[PDB]
């Protein structure tokens, strides 16, 4: 299938993944496009943050689904 990952900076990234793909495997495809180490990646789907070890299907992420790639801020 194909999913979309919109980031806090308004950027949209298109990925070619399978429902059985692992989150670790997704983070990497993202690292190849944006260059963000999987460790710093915060992917959220339908109010749930994705965790390594599980898979896209474990989050019911289906075709054409949209995820968010957010980050923590240092400013206060």
């Amino acid at each position: 299938m194909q999913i979309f990952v919109k980031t806090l900076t308004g950027k949209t990234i298109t990925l070619e993944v399978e429902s059985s793909d692992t989150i670790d495997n997704v983070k990497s495809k993202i690292q190849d496009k944006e260059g963000i180490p999987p460790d710093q990646q915060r992917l959220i789907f339908a109010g749930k943050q994705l965790e390594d070890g599980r898979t896209l299907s474990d989050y019911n992420i289906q075709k054409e689904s949209t995820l968010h790639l957010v980050l923590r801020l240092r400013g206060g």
């Binding site: 308004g10 959220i44 943050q49 801020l73 400013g75 206060g76």
Partner: protein, 986 residues
Amino acid sequence: TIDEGLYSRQLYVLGHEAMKQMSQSNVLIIGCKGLGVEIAKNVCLAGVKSVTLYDPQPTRIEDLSSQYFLTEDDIGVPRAKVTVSKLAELNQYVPVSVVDELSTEYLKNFKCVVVTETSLTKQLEINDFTHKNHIAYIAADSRGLFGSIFCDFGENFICTDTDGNEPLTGMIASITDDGVVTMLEETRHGLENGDFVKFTEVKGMPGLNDGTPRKVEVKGPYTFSIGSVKDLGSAGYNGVFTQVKVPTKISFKSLRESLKDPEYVYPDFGKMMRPPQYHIAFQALSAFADAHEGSLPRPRNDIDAAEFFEFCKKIASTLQFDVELDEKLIKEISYQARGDLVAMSAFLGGAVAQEVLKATTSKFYPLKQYFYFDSLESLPSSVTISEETCKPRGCRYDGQIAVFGSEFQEKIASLSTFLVGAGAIGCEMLKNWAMMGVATGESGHISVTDMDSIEKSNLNRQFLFRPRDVGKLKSECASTAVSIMNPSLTGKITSYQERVGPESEGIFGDEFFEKLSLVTNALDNVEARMYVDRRCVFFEKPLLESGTLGTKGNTQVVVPHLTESYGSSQDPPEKSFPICTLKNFPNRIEHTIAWARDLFEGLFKQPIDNVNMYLSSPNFLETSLKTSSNPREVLENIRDYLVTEKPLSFEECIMWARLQFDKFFNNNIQQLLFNFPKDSVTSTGQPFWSGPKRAPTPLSFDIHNREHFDFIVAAASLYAFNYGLKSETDPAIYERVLAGYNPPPFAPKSGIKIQVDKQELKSIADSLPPPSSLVGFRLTPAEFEKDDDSNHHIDFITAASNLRAMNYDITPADRFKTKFVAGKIVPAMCTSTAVVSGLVCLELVKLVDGKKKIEEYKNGFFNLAIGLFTFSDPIASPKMKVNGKEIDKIWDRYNLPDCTLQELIDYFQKEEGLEVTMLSSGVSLLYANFQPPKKLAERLPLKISELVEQITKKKLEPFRKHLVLEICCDDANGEDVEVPFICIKL
């Protein structure tokens, strides 16, 4: 034109041109309750032309649940007139007036109109006019844990910046005639299809460097297409591109026609199916109002709910909204209908406020067009929520009790918080806590700490402070300021000036923590957050975290024995340029600026310190060669700053300044070009100065050149400041000593280290006078200070940066940008700070409710610039199995008294089923079953504390209350296993 001493921060997120539109925009705000006041507060601090209020209604006691500008005795008086007096006190540059009449024509005076606490019927009447005359219309409402914002900026509104981001930029390596632009060495361009870019400095295709934008077709992360361009050349080489932000028109529907086909902006893709329901409910809330004379459903009332529910079905069909009404959900809005939470007002306030700025600047993508939010998870479940418990009480907390109940209100009152930080977020936090009545009870108590003082620029995001407060402590001033908003806090707040960290552990010790209910961060640096986090985890206390960056902001809740801590996840470090890029091969203005800043520190700070240190520490000289990295630099800094070059007149300083010029903008350059010829080549036969390396060019002095002059003036003045000499400003004075200057010839030496003595150095230290000869003498080191102009600090750096800029043919930058980068300023404003504070408190109530289910907490992430909001459940602390029992790798620990080694060992084996094989404290090994029967026999009988002091050979400190230990042991199977730490409570 624009006050950069105040709007400094906010200008980095909005921009000048953007604020000039604001200063010429009049805003109107209907309603002056929690929401309305919050909106105003921000709009005022924002810098619009003026603010106009309108709210005839009295001042019910319940209004004080979120209206921090209404006191106990203002009851009766029109909220409009009562608050206008304080909002005017916020931003001087912004006048605040009131109006008693609501004229349709009168509206054409304001660029934007905010509508709060108004019936739908009245709303239409207002939008119909506003929309037709092209007048920004915004409507919002806070109903308990529910909220809603609507926007209408005309059917032809134009946006000139849709994301707020800085126009991308990047160096090129090549570009085919087909339009195949290839980025530099592994450099990412970060462009999206449909983006436009212009070019500059591209050889092989001159007509390309004209400026005309070109649509981009991303072919990969390192390459993109712009279409065939063979009619401009055959192949371009190394250049630089720049993204062109193309505006776009956004067509808004009238509240009337949009009410039919509403366009939702989902703030949470997890509650995807709720906005529609809310669209109905909120209108039903309006209908019900008219029926009962503008009054809303009674708190947790069932009869009103039933009726309310009917109105839903009423408009559900008339609007022909084909949806399955969710009775339970919708009825919830009826119960909480009278709810007036301050957190909800802070959230929707900063949010709406930002929208107003958008409508008056055409900057950032607006909410189009329905924003229905809810934090239903906040609703308490550890107390009884009934029509009875949520009944009014005649106190300022009715608006809150209406949602959580009187029973719950007690818990909030008896809280013992600890706010770390008193800046932007700090103020908003206190404000919210005041309205919520935190620490108002008996055992309640707030503790605010911060080691910084108030500054002009701070008065833009930190409202609890005033200009006349500048120079005063934040924690202390904010504390007092809060006692006025809710007197019930007087004597309930303790302020501190201690910097939270390892040192302050004296004040914030075990006893201090064991009392706290929870901790909230309002910090500005990652290091501090980390420290607090660690402590909270050790003391098993909850922590509320939040951050901001311009329009972006984030929230994170860390609850004990449930979620992971703040430091459990990782964040990207600070981007620091390569030492050899700033030193010799800069290509971006940011490079020269960082360089300029080291130059500053290297000529007016580092050297001075060595002078004073030499006149204070006895064995300073000796201990230097033993530690100091560049003992040479040290010895020289003294020799030159004490005698070799000690000035005696500003005129003698101008000579020094002039010398520096050639030393860092001429000779240094020459020396480089000597080691690396302006056309020399590499081993691959490629031009050494190609791509990432711009060929420099020594600069000859010129008494009549802004940069050249600005540098001399700054440099000289600063050198003076060091020795204490009257700095001059009259230009003629410089010429009179510079025009008659003769610089010693410079010839680049052979054999110099450029990255891509035992007697000399020690002999020079003998040419220096003994500290004895200059007893009591000291120099004045220059402490960098971005926020000022009477110090020549930024003036220096700008010039120094723009001078090195000329060296490497790099485009210069005004002191506005230079200040931003040189001082590493964090762009930010009031809007974001408010949004986070709200979200933060919306979670705070979840902690006092004692919610144990993780799916109920939420971490926030948002970017006002694009109207993006997203939340996610917190990550669970990593668990682990030891002897079948599940343990928390983050929170569980073994609590034991100061027992004997033998005892502790027996304990683990008899009570935990663990055979302790190794015990340690820090880097010291206290015990190990594989040690000789001697070492053991002599220690086993000792008490832990005793054993520690012995092995450490350093007796414990009497200010300690705890003592952490690590252990290694085997489970019941004899197999090594990992267990929690041990906390000896001695």
